[PDB]
Amino acid sequence: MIQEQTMLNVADNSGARRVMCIKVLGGSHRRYAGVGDIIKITIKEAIPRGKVKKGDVLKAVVVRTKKGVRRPDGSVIRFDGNACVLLNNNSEQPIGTRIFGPVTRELRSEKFMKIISLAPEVL
Amino acid sequence: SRYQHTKGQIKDNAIEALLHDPLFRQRVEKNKKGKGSYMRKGKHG
Amino acid sequence: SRGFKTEIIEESEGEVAGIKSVTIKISGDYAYGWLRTETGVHRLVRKSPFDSGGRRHTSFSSAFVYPEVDEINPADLRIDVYRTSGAGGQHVNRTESAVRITHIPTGIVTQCQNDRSQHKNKDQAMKQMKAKLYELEMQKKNAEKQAMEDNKSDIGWGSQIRSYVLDDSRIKDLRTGVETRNTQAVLDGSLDQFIEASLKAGL
RNA sequence: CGCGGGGUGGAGCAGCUGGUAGCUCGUCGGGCUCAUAACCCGAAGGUCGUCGGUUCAAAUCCGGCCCCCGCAACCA
RNA sequence: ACUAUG
RNA sequence: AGCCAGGAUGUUGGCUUAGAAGCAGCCAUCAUUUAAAGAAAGCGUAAUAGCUCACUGGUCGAGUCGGCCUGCGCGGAAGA
RNA sequence: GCUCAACGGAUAAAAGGUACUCCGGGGAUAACAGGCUGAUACCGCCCAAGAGUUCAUAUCGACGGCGGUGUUUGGCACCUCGAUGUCGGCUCAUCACAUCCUGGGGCUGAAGUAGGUCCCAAGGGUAUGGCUGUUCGCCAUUUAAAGUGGUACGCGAGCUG
RNA sequence: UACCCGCAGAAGAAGCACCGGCUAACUCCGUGCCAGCAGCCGCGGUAAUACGGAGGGUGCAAGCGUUAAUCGGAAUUACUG
Known part of the structure; x- marks a missing residue:
């Protein structure tokens, strides 16, 4: 349950380090992103050189949450920190070419098939 | 190849602006006799 | 001698001689389009009567023509x-x-x-x-x-259009190549070998 | 708009009590200087914003029109 | 009482 | 009123216009064919052509065309 | 012998301040809400010169003309001066339709996608932040859309101040 | 393979920089403070030994020039001095 003003860590290698959510996309009045949901973000910390600079606005996709995902049998996966992969604003492909940390099957789609390649672990 | 003039950005009339550049500027000549005409060396000897 | 009427709007005399600037209105028919060839820089060469030496100088002066x-x-x-x-x-x-x-x-x-x-x-x-x-x-x-x-x-440097040379005693429109040897014709007024042959040959 | 003031040679000013337009600078012409500036001599130039009234007569008194300033436009 | 510049 | 046929020839009238041939704009007032047709009424072409009305004979068989005056009506006419 | 000109002449002789204020009165008289009005404002129609390569009316529409609404700035002073507490924000709404989205249509200077304009339609729906006390607005990022109004410019014996 | 012998025929084999002074080597034509040259002084504004071309000449020569870099010249960091 990422919402406006939530700060997330960055799973990819893109340059960014912390980012802040600033909309949850795909609806009027929409409160939360969970896993596999697109959000508009801004970059706060960013490492000295790298694809993206502090203050850049772009999309991301949420890939890990503390609240957790739920699986059809009742099972929950929680993680220990909120996290996201930075995306282009228009194509909505990844910027990063590597991915740190585990991710989930909730991504497994047409759209984010590039990520679930690059992940170390899918749970 | 484009003259780089010493006037800044021209704003109105350019001919009158170049008139007041070193580009134009009186060319006077050395007299070879009388009244500014002394050489030490002279062109060859 | 083309019958236009020829005001002075503004002058400035130089402290010794001649003028710093001048502005001249030209009332008459197809005025602008005769004179519009003469916008540009003009180059004199003579032994100066003001130089206590008596050196060949090489002055410049604009003309600039704009319609109303x-x-x-x-x-x-x-x-x-x-x-x-x-x-x-x-x-x-x-x-x-x-x-x-x-x-x-x-x-x-x-x-x-x-x-x-x-x-x-x-x-x-x-x-x-x-x-x-x-x-x-x-x-x-x-x-x-x-x-x-x-x-x-x-x-x-192309902005200069004519070259009056009163000690080698000749001239050149630099655009066309049209030339005289009569210097005190043209200064008294008789230009038109320059002004026509510009228009005709298209500036 | 409410109240008040001002438009005068090219510039800044005086003259506004009806019959008379001055002052300093500038312009023009002559001199002095090798030349210019200063300095000396001589001459001009003002529809008095604009339109209309009043008077025999209007810069001047009176009205409208135009521009330019200043003061006022408050209590809720 | 004189004076500045080229 | 409907229904069928004809609406031409000098000639794209002239002048403008890249083009202006009835039909962008401007100036304008023919005879010929005779049943009659504008030197052009509206679509339409880059322009002709194309369609079609004024105009006219055929067919059919009783009232009909459109102004003036006056009565009553219709639209114009949305709010907590 | 008085410009006692406030000219039927208060004295021979007189200006201000009060947000520190007080008393008596007035809705005879103002500010706020209501009322009458509708110059102004908003919405609509009539005429059609012209723009739109050609063509007034797909879209616009000069010079002028006729209305509607009661929404804004006013005008009037009818109600309230032995009190009808004000902008904005919060909470809760409710109606109108001159419709922002969704639904149905007609014309298009509508190939398609996507638009323009008009007619019907009020069922439901109709952002979050930065700045500012702000309404308004500008900006950022969304959304199918971020509609225009009425309700003491709805709502303080409900909150804030 | 070095090296040695035979065959044919001057045959198959010369450029680069410079020529105002410093610095060895000069005259024409074009150009007219333009175009350009230039290490430093400077050359060029209608007779240019200094620009561009030609002819001649000087210097190197399978190389010749430009640039960069070090020492020299520089007794211009001096012990020598």
């Missing part, structure tokens, strides 16, 4: 009207004095809210809206001189 030439629709304006900020009891809080006209083509806006009357504020803010649309006639006019005048200053 001689209300905002309520549809184009939106007019927001709203309450004022500030000091004075029940009357300030309620009434909507304040105006904000806006031009939909450009984006320029205005206000007034000095007055109590909405109708004063409106016709005041109409005045500032006249002025501020007259002001973007100056910033198009001035930035489409210095568009066209930046790439006329491109041409540089």
Whole structure:
């Protein structure tokens, strides 16, 4: 349950380090992103050189949450920190070419098939 | 190849602006006799 | 000797001799288009009568020829009207004095809210809206001189058009190649081998 | 708009009590200087914003029109 | 009582 | 009123126009064919052509065309 | 012998301040809400010169003309001066339709996608932040859309101040 | 393979920089403070030994020039001095 003003860590290698959510996309009045949901973000910390600079606005996709995902049998996966992969604003492909940390099957789609390649672990 | 003039950005009339550049500027000549005409060396000897 | 009437608008004499500048109106028929070839720089060469030496000088002088030439629709304006900020009891809080006209083509806006009357504020803010649309006639006019005048200053040493040479006792229009040896013809007035043969050959 | 003031040679000013337009600078012409500036001599130039009235007569008194300033536009 | 510049 | 046929020839009238041939704009007032047809009424071409009305004979068989005066009506006519 | 000109002449002789204020009165008289009005404002129609390569009316529409609404700035002083507490914000709404989205249509200077304009339609729906006390507005990022109004410019014996 | 012998025919094999002074080597034509040259002084504004071309000449020569870099010249960091 990422919402406006939530700060997330960055799973990819893109340059960014912390980012802040600033909309949850795909609806009027929409409160939360969970896993596999697109959000508009801004970059706060960013490492000295790298694809993206502090203050850049772009999309991301949420890939890990503390609240957790739920699986059809009742099972929950929680993680220990909120996290996201930075995306282009228009194509909505990844910027990063590597991915740190585990991710989930909730991504497994047409759209984010590039990520679930690059992940170390899918749970 | 484009003259780089010493006037800044021209704003109105350019001919009158170049008139007041070193580009134009009186060319006077050395007299070879009388009244500014002394050489030490002279062109060859 | 082409029958135009020939005012002086403005002079400035030099302290010793000649003139620093001058402006000359030319009343008559197809004036501009005769003279428009003569805009440019002109190069003299002579032994100067003012130099105590007596050296060949090589002065320059412009001529420049330019011809002469001689209300905002309520549809184009939106007019927001709203309450004022500030000091004075029940009357300030309620009434909507304040105006904000806006031009939909450009984006320029205005206000007034000095007055109590909405109708004063409106016709005041109409005045500032006249002025501020007259002001973007100056910033198009001035930035489409210095568009066209930046790439006329491109041409540089070419800007000089004629070369009068009163001790080697001859001349050249530098564009055409048209030449005389009669120096005191042309200075008294007899130009027209230069002025025609420019037009004919297309500047 | 309410009240008041001002438009005079090219510039800044005086003359406004009806019959008379001055002051300093500038312009023009002559001199002095090798030349220019200063300095000396001589000459001009003002529809008195604009339109209309009043008077025998209007810069001047009176009205409208135009521009330019200043003061006021308050209590809720 | 004189004076500045080229 | 309907229904069928004809609406031409000098000639794209002239002048303008990249083009203007009835039909962008401007100036304008023919005879010929005779049943009669504008030197052009509206679509339409880059322009002709194309369609079609004024105009006219055929067919059919009783009232009909459109102004003036006056009565009553219709639309125009959305609010907590 | 008085410009006692405030000219039926208060004295021979007289200006201000009060947000530190007080008393008596007035809705005879103002500010706020209501009322009458509708110059102004908003919405609509009539005429059609012209723009739209050609063509007034797909879209616009000069010079002028006729209305509607009661929404803004006013005008009037009818109600309230032995009190009808004000902008904005919060909470809770409710109606109108001159419709922002969704639904049905007609014309298009509608190939398609996507638009323009008009007619019907009020069932439901109709952002979050930065700045500012702000309404309004500008900006950022969304959304199918971020509609225009009425309700003491709805709502303080409900909150804030 | 070095090296040695035979065959044919001058055959198959010369450029680069410079020529105002410093610095060895000069005259024409074009150009007219333009175009250009230039290490430093400077050359060029209608008779240019200094620009560009030609003819001649000087210097190197399978190389010749330009640039960069070090020492020299520089007794211009001096012990020598």
